[PDB]
PDB file of C-alpha atoms in Angstrom:
ATOM      1  CA  UNK A   1      16.846 162.311-100.066  1.00  0.00           C
ATOM      2  CA  UNK A   2      16.062 163.859-103.489  1.00  0.00           C
ATOM      3  CA  UNK A   3      12.783 165.162-104.779  1.00  0.00           C
ATOM      4  CA  UNK A   4      11.893 165.875-108.508  1.00  0.00           C
ATOM      5  CA  UNK A   5       9.855 168.892-109.385  1.00  0.00           C
ATOM      6  CA  UNK A   6       7.996 168.552-112.733  1.00  0.00           C
ATOM      7  CA  UNK A   7       7.031 171.888-114.127  1.00  0.00           C
ATOM      8  CA  UNK A   8       4.409 172.449-116.904  1.00  0.00           C
ATOM      9  CA  UNK A   9       4.307 175.745-118.804  1.00  0.00           C
ATOM     10  CA  UNK A  10       1.494 178.246-119.540  1.00  0.00           C
ATOM     11  CA  UNK A  11      -0.274 178.546-122.946  1.00  0.00           C
ATOM     12  CA  UNK A  12       2.129 179.113-125.731  1.00  0.00           C
ATOM     13  CA  UNK A  13       5.028 178.532-123.455  1.00  0.00           C
ATOM     14  CA  UNK A  14       7.855 175.999-123.357  1.00  0.00           C
ATOM     15  CA  UNK A  15       9.836 173.999-120.771  1.00  0.00           C
ATOM     16  CA  UNK A  16      12.507 176.714-121.005  1.00  0.00           C
ATOM     17  CA  UNK A  17      10.508 179.151-118.938  1.00  0.00           C
ATOM     18  CA  UNK A  18      11.711 177.014-115.969  1.00  0.00           C
ATOM     19  CA  UNK A  19      15.406 176.717-116.928  1.00  0.00           C
ATOM     20  CA  UNK A  20      16.238 179.780-114.802  1.00  0.00           C
ATOM     21  CA  UNK A  21      14.630 178.041-111.801  1.00  0.00           C
ATOM     22  CA  UNK A  22      17.861 176.085-111.308  1.00  0.00           C
ATOM     23  CA  UNK A  23      19.520 179.059-109.841  1.00  0.00           C
ATOM     24  CA  UNK A  24      17.083 179.487-106.770  1.00  0.00           C
ATOM     25  CA  UNK A  25      15.687 175.992-106.193  1.00  0.00           C
ATOM     26  CA  UNK A  26      16.944 173.990-103.204  1.00  0.00           C
ATOM     27  CA  UNK A  27      19.968 171.957-103.824  1.00  0.00           C
ATOM     28  CA  UNK A  28      18.143 168.648-103.284  1.00  0.00           C
ATOM     29  CA  UNK A  29      15.498 169.561-105.834  1.00  0.00           C
ATOM     30  CA  UNK A  30      15.900 168.204-109.330  1.00  0.00           C
ATOM     31  CA  UNK A  31      14.286 170.375-111.967  1.00  0.00           C
ATOM     32  CA  UNK A  32      12.327 168.287-114.408  1.00  0.00           C
ATOM     33  CA  UNK A  33      10.643 170.735-116.948  1.00  0.00           C
ATOM     34  CA  UNK A  34       8.013 168.855-119.105  1.00  0.00           C
ATOM     35  CA  UNK A  35       7.957 169.760-122.657  1.00  0.00           C
ATOM     36  CA  UNK A  36       4.471 169.782-124.299  1.00  0.00           C
ATOM     37  CA  UNK A  37       4.491 168.562-127.810  1.00  0.00           C
ATOM     38  CA  UNK A  38       5.011 171.026-130.802  1.00  0.00           C
ATOM     39  CA  UNK A  39       7.009 173.728-129.245  1.00  0.00           C
ATOM     40  CA  UNK A  40      10.521 174.067-127.667  1.00  0.00           C
ATOM     41  CA  UNK A  41      12.579 171.037-127.691  1.00  0.00           C
ATOM     42  CA  UNK A  42       9.675 168.972-129.039  1.00  0.00           C
ATOM     43  CA  UNK A  43       8.798 171.444-131.915  1.00  0.00           C
ATOM     44  CA  UNK A  44       8.939 168.561-134.369  1.00  0.00           C
ATOM     45  CA  UNK A  45       6.053 166.723-132.615  1.00  0.00           C
ATOM     46  CA  UNK A  46       2.494 167.337-133.741  1.00  0.00           C
ATOM     47  CA  UNK A  47       0.398 169.569-131.515  1.00  0.00           C
ATOM     48  CA  UNK A  48      -2.067 167.924-129.051  1.00  0.00           C
ATOM     49  CA  UNK A  49      -5.547 167.294-130.131  1.00  0.00           C
ATOM     50  CA  UNK A  50      -7.360 167.224-126.763  1.00  0.00           C
ATOM     51  CA  UNK A  51      -6.612 167.593-123.070  1.00  0.00           C
ATOM     52  CA  UNK A  52      -6.674 163.884-122.651  1.00  0.00           C
ATOM     53  CA  UNK A  53      -4.109 163.428-125.401  1.00  0.00           C
ATOM     54  CA  UNK A  54      -2.029 166.185-124.024  1.00  0.00           C
ATOM     55  CA  UNK A  55      -1.984 164.561-120.638  1.00  0.00           C
ATOM     56  CA  UNK A  56      -0.954 161.121-122.067  1.00  0.00           C
ATOM     57  CA  UNK A  57       1.827 162.961-123.918  1.00  0.00           C
ATOM     58  CA  UNK A  58       3.182 164.573-120.743  1.00  0.00           C
ATOM     59  CA  UNK A  59       2.980 161.268-118.779  1.00  0.00           C
ATOM     60  CA  UNK A  60       5.319 159.672-121.443  1.00  0.00           C
ATOM     61  CA  UNK A  61       7.611 162.524-120.615  1.00  0.00           C
ATOM     62  CA  UNK A  62       7.184 162.135-116.935  1.00  0.00           C
ATOM     63  CA  UNK A  63       8.188 158.445-117.056  1.00  0.00           C
ATOM     64  CA  UNK A  64      11.527 159.322-118.778  1.00  0.00           C
ATOM     65  CA  UNK A  65      12.976 160.370-115.344  1.00  0.00           C
ATOM     66  CA  UNK A  66      10.485 159.055-112.732  1.00  0.00           C
ATOM     67  CA  UNK A  67      11.827 156.163-110.581  1.00  0.00           C
ATOM     68  CA  UNK A  68       9.370 156.070-107.533  1.00  0.00           C
ATOM     69  CA  UNK A  69      10.915 158.764-105.129  1.00  0.00           C
ATOM     70  CA  UNK A  70       9.311 161.972-103.902  1.00  0.00           C
ATOM     71  CA  UNK A  71       7.976 164.388-106.397  1.00  0.00           C
ATOM     72  CA  UNK A  72       5.934 167.586-106.871  1.00  0.00           C
ATOM     73  CA  UNK A  73       4.145 169.200-109.714  1.00  0.00           C
ATOM     74  CA  UNK A  74       4.045 172.952-110.649  1.00  0.00           C
ATOM     75  CA  UNK A  75       2.075 174.248-113.488  1.00  0.00           C
ATOM     76  CA  UNK A  76       1.025 177.897-114.614  1.00  0.00           C
ATOM     77  CA  UNK A  77      -2.426 178.570-116.063  1.00  0.00           C
ATOM     78  CA  UNK A  78      -3.111 175.837-118.752  1.00  0.00           C
ATOM     79  CA  UNK A  79      -0.134 174.093-117.193  1.00  0.00           C
ATOM     80  CA  UNK A  80      -1.996 174.127-113.916  1.00  0.00           C
ATOM     81  CA  UNK A  81      -5.029 172.380-115.376  1.00  0.00           C
ATOM     82  CA  UNK A  82      -2.753 169.929-117.058  1.00  0.00           C
ATOM     83  CA  UNK A  83      -0.928 169.442-113.793  1.00  0.00           C
ATOM     84  CA  UNK A  84      -4.187 168.611-112.035  1.00  0.00           C
ATOM     85  CA  UNK A  85      -5.179 166.172-114.802  1.00  0.00           C
ATOM     86  CA  UNK A  86      -1.761 164.597-114.986  1.00  0.00           C
ATOM     87  CA  UNK A  87      -1.462 163.862-111.155  1.00  0.00           C
ATOM     88  CA  UNK A  88      -4.723 161.957-111.228  1.00  0.00           C
ATOM     89  CA  UNK A  89      -3.593 160.112-114.572  1.00  0.00           C
ATOM     90  CA  UNK A  90      -0.326 159.166-112.681  1.00  0.00           C
ATOM     91  CA  UNK A  91      -2.380 157.958-109.726  1.00  0.00           C
ATOM     92  CA  UNK A  92      -4.622 155.937-112.205  1.00  0.00           C
ATOM     93  CA  UNK A  93      -1.315 154.304-113.262  1.00  0.00           C
ATOM     94  CA  UNK A  94      -0.428 153.128-109.741  1.00  0.00           C
ATOM     95  CA  UNK A  95       2.309 155.710-108.798  1.00  0.00           C
ATOM     96  CA  UNK A  96       2.348 157.188-105.331  1.00  0.00           C
ATOM     97  CA  UNK A  97       0.942 160.546-104.375  1.00  0.00           C
ATOM     98  CA  UNK A  98       3.072 163.685-104.972  1.00  0.00           C
ATOM     99  CA  UNK A  99       4.485 165.594-101.956  1.00  0.00           C
ATOM    100  CA  UNK A 100       2.822 168.711-102.880  1.00  0.00           C
ATOM    101  CA  UNK A 101       1.159 170.439-105.866  1.00  0.00           C
ATOM    102  CA  UNK A 102       1.442 173.970-107.046  1.00  0.00           C
ATOM    103  CA  UNK A 103      -1.311 175.617-109.208  1.00  0.00           C
ATOM    104  CA  UNK A 104      -0.060 179.080-110.271  1.00  0.00           C
ATOM    105  CA  UNK A 105      -2.307 181.528-112.197  1.00  0.00           C
ATOM    106  CA  UNK A 106      -4.998 178.822-112.428  1.00  0.00           C
ATOM    107  CA  UNK A 107      -8.639 179.025-111.689  1.00  0.00           C
ATOM    108  CA  UNK A 108     -10.140 175.840-109.996  1.00  0.00           C
ATOM    109  CA  UNK A 109     -10.587 172.911-112.424  1.00  0.00           C
ATOM    110  CA  UNK A 110     -14.290 172.780-111.881  1.00  0.00           C
ATOM    111  CA  UNK A 111     -14.467 176.498-112.731  1.00  0.00           C
ATOM    112  CA  UNK A 112     -11.729 176.539-115.299  1.00  0.00           C
ATOM    113  CA  UNK A 113     -14.118 177.675-117.949  1.00  0.00           C
ATOM    114  CA  UNK A 114     -13.439 180.346-120.621  1.00  0.00           C
ATOM    115  CA  UNK A 115     -15.992 183.208-120.532  1.00  0.00           C
ATOM    116  CA  UNK A 116     -15.262 183.358-124.298  1.00  0.00           C
ATOM    117  CA  UNK A 117     -14.274 181.011-127.034  1.00  0.00           C
ATOM    118  CA  UNK A 118     -11.213 182.767-128.550  1.00  0.00           C
ATOM    119  CA  UNK A 119      -9.600 179.857-130.304  1.00  0.00           C
ATOM    120  CA  UNK A 120     -12.032 180.095-133.132  1.00  0.00           C
ATOM    121  CA  UNK A 121     -11.174 183.698-134.106  1.00  0.00           C
ATOM    122  CA  UNK A 122      -9.164 184.457-137.192  1.00  0.00           C
ATOM    123  CA  UNK A 123      -5.378 184.510-136.180  1.00  0.00           C
ATOM    124  CA  UNK A 124      -5.138 188.344-136.334  1.00  0.00           C
ATOM    125  CA  UNK A 125      -8.105 188.886-134.110  1.00  0.00           C
ATOM    126  CA  UNK A 126      -7.025 186.185-131.687  1.00  0.00           C
ATOM    127  CA  UNK A 127      -3.580 187.620-131.116  1.00  0.00           C
ATOM    128  CA  UNK A 128      -5.025 191.116-130.665  1.00  0.00           C
ATOM    129  CA  UNK A 129      -7.528 189.735-128.104  1.00  0.00           C
ATOM    130  CA  UNK A 130      -5.022 187.864-126.014  1.00  0.00           C
ATOM    131  CA  UNK A 131      -2.561 190.830-126.055  1.00  0.00           C
ATOM    132  CA  UNK A 132      -5.547 192.870-124.793  1.00  0.00           C
ATOM    133  CA  UNK A 133      -6.231 190.327-121.857  1.00  0.00           C
ATOM    134  CA  UNK A 134      -2.557 190.002-120.819  1.00  0.00           C
ATOM    135  CA  UNK A 135      -2.396 186.394-122.005  1.00  0.00           C
ATOM    136  CA  UNK A 136       0.931 186.961-123.473  1.00  0.00           C
ATOM    137  CA  UNK A 137       3.356 189.955-123.477  1.00  0.00           C
ATOM    138  CA  UNK A 138       2.432 192.911-125.631  1.00  0.00           C
ATOM    139  CA  UNK A 139       6.052 193.066-127.046  1.00  0.00           C
ATOM    140  CA  UNK A 140       4.892 190.119-129.331  1.00  0.00           C
ATOM    141  CA  UNK A 141       3.553 192.274-132.019  1.00  0.00           C
ATOM    142  CA  UNK A 142       6.936 193.997-132.374  1.00  0.00           C
ATOM    143  CA  UNK A 143       8.450 191.073-134.247  1.00  0.00           C
ATOM    144  CA  UNK A 144       6.011 189.948-136.872  1.00  0.00           C
ATOM    145  CA  UNK A 145       8.357 187.139-137.779  1.00  0.00           C
ATOM    146  CA  UNK A 146       8.085 185.889-134.260  1.00  0.00           C
ATOM    147  CA  UNK A 147       4.249 186.101-134.453  1.00  0.00           C
ATOM    148  CA  UNK A 148       3.856 184.023-137.578  1.00  0.00           C
ATOM    149  CA  UNK A 149       5.591 181.038-136.269  1.00  0.00           C
ATOM    150  CA  UNK A 150       4.305 181.521-132.693  1.00  0.00           C
ATOM    151  CA  UNK A 151       0.549 182.101-133.322  1.00  0.00           C
ATOM    152  CA  UNK A 152      -0.464 178.484-134.031  1.00  0.00           C
ATOM    153  CA  UNK A 153       1.160 177.227-130.903  1.00  0.00           C
ATOM    154  CA  UNK A 154      -0.444 179.650-128.363  1.00  0.00           C
ATOM    155  CA  UNK A 155      -3.788 179.300-130.253  1.00  0.00           C
ATOM    156  CA  UNK A 156      -3.636 175.455-129.948  1.00  0.00           C
ATOM    157  CA  UNK A 157      -3.134 175.786-126.194  1.00  0.00           C
ATOM    158  CA  UNK A 158      -6.081 178.058-125.915  1.00  0.00           C
ATOM    159  CA  UNK A 159      -8.071 175.460-127.832  1.00  0.00           C
ATOM    160  CA  UNK A 160      -7.104 172.862-125.235  1.00  0.00           C
ATOM    161  CA  UNK A 161      -8.071 175.052-122.302  1.00  0.00           C
ATOM    162  CA  UNK A 162     -11.388 176.199-123.867  1.00  0.00           C
ATOM    163  CA  UNK A 163     -12.572 172.735-124.880  1.00  0.00           C
ATOM    164  CA  UNK A 164     -11.666 171.472-121.400  1.00  0.00           C
ATOM    165  CA  UNK A 165     -14.590 169.847-119.675  1.00  0.00           C
ATOM    166  CA  UNK A 166     -14.064 168.911-115.951  1.00  0.00           C
ATOM    167  CA  UNK A 167     -15.174 165.452-114.910  1.00  0.00           C
ATOM    168  CA  UNK A 168     -14.927 164.635-111.241  1.00  0.00           C
ATOM    169  CA  UNK A 169     -12.353 162.051-110.128  1.00  0.00           C
ATOM    170  CA  UNK A 170     -12.176 158.716-108.334  1.00  0.00           C
ATOM    171  CA  UNK A 171     -10.166 160.081-105.449  1.00  0.00           C
ATOM    172  CA  UNK A 172      -9.261 163.132-103.309  1.00  0.00           C
ATOM    173  CA  UNK A 173      -5.599 164.176-103.374  1.00  0.00           C
ATOM    174  CA  UNK A 174      -3.886 163.812-100.038  1.00  0.00           C
ATOM    175  CA  UNK A 175      -1.099 166.191-100.391  1.00  0.00           C
ATOM    176  CA  UNK A 176      -0.972 170.127 -99.820  1.00  0.00           C
ATOM    177  CA  UNK A 177      -2.045 172.382-102.617  1.00  0.00           C
ATOM    178  CA  UNK A 178      -0.305 175.819-102.887  1.00  0.00           C
ATOM    179  CA  UNK A 179      -1.880 178.560-105.158  1.00  0.00           C
ATOM    180  CA  UNK A 180      -0.076 181.381-106.762  1.00  0.00           C
ATOM    181  CA  UNK A 181      -2.010 184.460-107.798  1.00  0.00           C
ATOM    182  CA  UNK A 182      -1.074 187.978-108.947  1.00  0.00           C
ATOM    183  CA  UNK A 183      -3.479 190.389-107.602  1.00  0.00           C
ATOM    184  CA  UNK A 184      -3.652 192.302-110.905  1.00  0.00           C
ATOM    185  CA  UNK A 185      -4.153 189.161-112.893  1.00  0.00           C
ATOM    186  CA  UNK A 186      -7.200 189.661-115.141  1.00  0.00           C
ATOM    187  CA  UNK A 187      -7.581 186.071-116.307  1.00  0.00           C
ATOM    188  CA  UNK A 188      -7.835 184.564-112.685  1.00  0.00           C
ATOM    189  CA  UNK A 189     -10.692 185.545-110.280  1.00  0.00           C
ATOM    190  CA  UNK A 190      -9.343 185.448-106.637  1.00  0.00           C
ATOM    191  CA  UNK A 191     -12.689 184.983-105.213  1.00  0.00           C
ATOM    192  CA  UNK A 192     -12.924 181.653-107.119  1.00  0.00           C
ATOM    193  CA  UNK A 193      -9.950 180.072-105.698  1.00  0.00           C
ATOM    194  CA  UNK A 194     -11.779 178.709-102.614  1.00  0.00           C
ATOM    195  CA  UNK A 195     -13.109 176.002-105.044  1.00  0.00           C
ATOM    196  CA  UNK A 196      -9.716 174.513-104.925  1.00  0.00           C
ATOM    197  CA  UNK A 197      -9.818 173.175-101.399  1.00  0.00           C
ATOM    198  CA  UNK A 198     -12.077 170.208-101.901  1.00  0.00           C
ATOM    199  CA  UNK A 199      -9.561 168.545-104.245  1.00  0.00           C
ATOM    200  CA  UNK A 200      -7.249 167.574-101.420  1.00  0.00           C
ATOM    201  CA  UNK A 201      -7.612 166.374 -97.801  1.00  0.00           C
ATOM    202  CA  UNK A 202      -4.751 168.542 -96.753  1.00  0.00           C
ATOM    203  CA  UNK A 203      -4.304 172.277 -96.279  1.00  0.00           C
ATOM    204  CA  UNK A 204      -4.675 174.519 -99.297  1.00  0.00           C
ATOM    205  CA  UNK A 205      -2.644 177.668 -99.155  1.00  0.00           C
ATOM    206  CA  UNK A 206      -2.905 180.872-101.275  1.00  0.00           C
ATOM    207  CA  UNK A 207      -0.108 183.306-101.929  1.00  0.00           C
ATOM    208  CA  UNK A 208      -1.004 186.601-103.617  1.00  0.00           C
ATOM    209  CA  UNK A 209       1.570 188.681-105.324  1.00  0.00           C
ATOM    210  CA  UNK A 210       0.825 192.379-104.935  1.00  0.00           C
ATOM    211  CA  UNK A 211       1.014 194.408-108.054  1.00  0.00           C
ATOM    212  CA  UNK A 212       1.456 191.478-110.339  1.00  0.00           C
ATOM    213  CA  UNK A 213      -0.258 190.447-113.477  1.00  0.00           C
ATOM    214  CA  UNK A 214      -0.586 186.983-115.154  1.00  0.00           C
ATOM    215  CA  UNK A 215       3.106 186.657-115.715  1.00  0.00           C
ATOM    216  CA  UNK A 216       4.264 187.240-112.238  1.00  0.00           C
ATOM    217  CA  UNK A 217       5.484 183.657-112.549  1.00  0.00           C
ATOM    218  CA  UNK A 218       8.326 184.961-114.707  1.00  0.00           C
ATOM    219  CA  UNK A 219       8.852 188.476-113.227  1.00  0.00           C
ATOM    220  CA  UNK A 220       8.836 187.268-109.631  1.00  0.00           C
ATOM    221  CA  UNK A 221      10.082 183.755-110.320  1.00  0.00           C
ATOM    222  CA  UNK A 222      12.645 183.951-107.506  1.00  0.00           C
ATOM    223  CA  UNK A 223       9.745 184.517-104.992  1.00  0.00           C
ATOM    224  CA  UNK A 224       7.730 181.728-106.458  1.00  0.00           C
ATOM    225  CA  UNK A 225      10.702 179.446-106.129  1.00  0.00           C
ATOM    226  CA  UNK A 226      11.247 180.787-102.549  1.00  0.00           C
ATOM    227  CA  UNK A 227       7.711 179.468-101.751  1.00  0.00           C
ATOM    228  CA  UNK A 228       8.278 176.168-103.538  1.00  0.00           C
ATOM    229  CA  UNK A 229      11.466 175.781-101.434  1.00  0.00           C
ATOM    230  CA  UNK A 230       9.715 176.514 -98.174  1.00  0.00           C
ATOM    231  CA  UNK A 231       6.792 174.181 -98.957  1.00  0.00           C
ATOM    232  CA  UNK A 232       9.120 171.453 -99.585  1.00  0.00           C
ATOM    233  CA  UNK A 233      11.521 172.200 -96.796  1.00  0.00           C
ATOM    234  CA  UNK A 234       8.364 172.218 -94.477  1.00  0.00           C
ATOM    235  CA  UNK A 235       7.350 168.802 -95.735  1.00  0.00           C
ATOM    236  CA  UNK A 236      10.788 167.306 -95.052  1.00  0.00           C
ATOM    237  CA  UNK A 237      10.330 168.229 -91.404  1.00  0.00           C
ATOM    238  CA  UNK A 238       6.749 167.159 -90.492  1.00  0.00           C
ATOM    239  CA  UNK A 239       5.459 165.266 -93.622  1.00  0.00           C
TER     240      UNK A 239
END
């Protein structure tokens, strides 16, 4: 059979971070990067206003290639919160349960709080703070051209994650959850990820990348896809 893997990017990111995944993903996995509005291929679209609007926006993307087969969802950081909210929104529409879900660099949705509200800082102070936190690569201040166009986009995505307020759901997921974590990640508290297990009736599994920061998802993408591959291959054998 075939399975489509929908991938959501981190804050400030675009679907193109996942284009390179097509060189390691299993041959019966169809890559389906989902482009959030206002960046990448959807740069002309207004930026989302609230998490619920951003989820409705991605669902419209989802239903451009979704015909009822098997599927999984991967998201990194904000993309992981959006993946969580999006799956329940898909289920609220009457679609089937995904095969598996991957939440990378993502604290549990009931604890996905910001210890600080950064999005209300002046642009200059915001970008210095997120460079300090490892919430974007430090080579971003090199090109000040790049920063001008880029700052509104990443600041909006921080606004979405900071104003996010978890509300419990009408259902427990019934698929496996896989969690990806870089042990040197300052924005994800390893101890907290145990709060992820109540959100599915199946096994949660955690994979820690040694000597890896927030952006292990790009630097070690081949290993991440190695695990996505083994998760899906393992479900094709035993369900």
